[PDB]
């Protein structure tokens, strides 16, 4: 965690950094603390939170995840039969 004063001096390489190692940087100040992250990592984060923020959606998705991790529930479909059906 860095102070707002150093973050301002070093903002440029701190932007290269978050784009390199994908770890958020925490910045402290009197006006409140902030997190700096790469734009790519922020988008991935916002989408992760979006999927998980509705309790019903979180439950179905993570149940799907659990069964996928057990590797014995999935079945196959060809994209042609899918296009077939959606026609």
């Amino acid at each position: 965690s860095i102070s707002a004063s150093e973050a301002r001096q070093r903002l440029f390489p701190l932007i290269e950094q978050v784009n390199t190692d994908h770890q958020p940087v925490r910045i402290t100040s009197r006006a409140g603390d902030a997190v700096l992250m790469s734009a790519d990592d922020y988008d991935a984060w916002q989408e992760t939170v979006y999927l998980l923020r509705s309790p019903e959606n979180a439950r179905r998705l993570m149940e799907a995840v659990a069964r996928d991790k057990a590797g014995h529930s999935a079945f196959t479909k060809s994209v042609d039969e899918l296009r077939e059906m959606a026609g």
Partner: protein, 85 residues
């Protein structure tokens, strides 16, 4: 060449759209095709999920609904194709 697998719930999502709104079902079908071709780039703004969803990806079906999947060299697996409330 990459085969397509469904989790049962993802399949029921697909069935649901076939009857509920067929353009959404065609969207999903196009998304799946593009995933199969190359899973991690292309249409629908693919995002590598974080945390407990690390290793999974989502693409946008709608401003609301997401296709969440996983991909290897031999197969792509669909986890969900509907956002739930």
């Amino acid at each position: 060449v990459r085969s397509v697998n469904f989790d049962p719930d993802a399949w029921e999502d697909f069935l649901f759209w076939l009857a509920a709104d067929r353009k959404t079902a065609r969207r999903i079908t196009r998304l799946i095709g593009e995933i199969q071709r190359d899973p991690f780039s292309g249409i629908g703004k693919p995002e590598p999920l974080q945390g407990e969803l690390s290793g999974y990806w989502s693409r946008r079906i709608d401003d609301e609904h997401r296709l969440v999947y996983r991909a290897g060299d031999d197969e792509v697996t669909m986890l969900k194709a509907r956002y739930h409330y």
